Amino acid sequence: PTACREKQYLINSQCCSLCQPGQKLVSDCTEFTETECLPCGESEFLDTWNRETHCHQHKYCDPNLGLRVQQKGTSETDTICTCEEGWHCTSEACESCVLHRSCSPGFGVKQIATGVSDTICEPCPVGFFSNVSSAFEKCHPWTSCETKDLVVQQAGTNKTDVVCGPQD
C-alpha cells in the first residue's frame, strides 16, 4: 500500500490530488491548498487524471489530404476528421483521403463513389458504350440504326457509338 491513493501523488509529506481529465498541473498541493490545475485551452485536450504540464493539441484535419473536421474536440476528447465531398478514405482508419476516380472510355459507372468507397466501374458490355472519362456517367446503349431505316455502317465498340448509313 503506497503512501497515497491511485488518484493522488506524494510530495512534501502531503497526498495531493492528481489533475482531472480536461486539466493540467500548474502547482503542487500544500498543507494549505489542494493541487493547482488549469483547464486545457479551447483547442486542447487531456483525457486522463494526470500531473502533466501541457495538454494535447486537438488533431489538425488537413485539407491537402482531403480531410475536413467532422466534430470539434472537447477538453477531454480529440477532434474527429472525415473526408471532404468528392474524396473517399484511403483505408478503414481514414487518416487521409483520395479523389474519386473516373471510369475511363470503354467503362461506365456501376456504383457512384461515397465518402467510404471509390467509384465502381464496369467494362461496357455489348450494345453499350462510354466515350468519356467520368465519375458519374453510366454505360449508354448503342443507337438502333433500324429504327431510323438505316444499317450499321461502322460497328459500335465499348468506346464508340454505331455510325448508321444507307443500304447497299
Binding site: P1, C4, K7, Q20, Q23, T33, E34
Partner: protein, 159 residues
Amino acid sequence: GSDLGKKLLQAARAGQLDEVRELLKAGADVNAKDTWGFTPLHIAAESGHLEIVEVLLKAGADVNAKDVQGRTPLHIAAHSGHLEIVEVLLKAGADVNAKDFRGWTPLHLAAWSGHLEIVEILLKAGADVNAQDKSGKTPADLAARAGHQDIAEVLQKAA
C-alpha cells in the same frame, strides 16, 4: 471475512456493478475502508460510477464517512466534477458544509476545480459561501486564485 471488503473495494474501482451487487448479497461490509480511508462510496464518487453509488446507498453506506484527510464522498464527488453523484449524495443526507483537514468544504473544492454547475447545486442545498478554510480563504477566494472568474462572480453575488 474482510476478504469480501477488499473484493468490494476493487469491484467499485473497476466499475463492475454486477460484482458489487453479488458481494453485497454475500455479506460484504458496505463501509469497508482501504488504507487511505476510502469506502466503496468514496471510490465510486471519484470514478463517476452513478449506478454503483445508488446501490451502495440503498445497502446502507455511510453518506458522511470520512477518509484519512477528512473528505466525505460529497467532497470527492464535488472535487471530481460528478454532478449527478453530488445531487444523489445530497438527497441521501450528505453534510453540505463538512470540513476536511484543510477546512475545505465541498463548495471550496468545486470552486477550486472550476465546476460551476456543482457550485450552483451546492448553494441551492445551503452551502456556506462565507466558510473559511484554515488559511482564511473562502470559496470565492479560491475560484479567483484558480482563474475561475465565472464562479468567483457567482460566489461574490451569492454573498
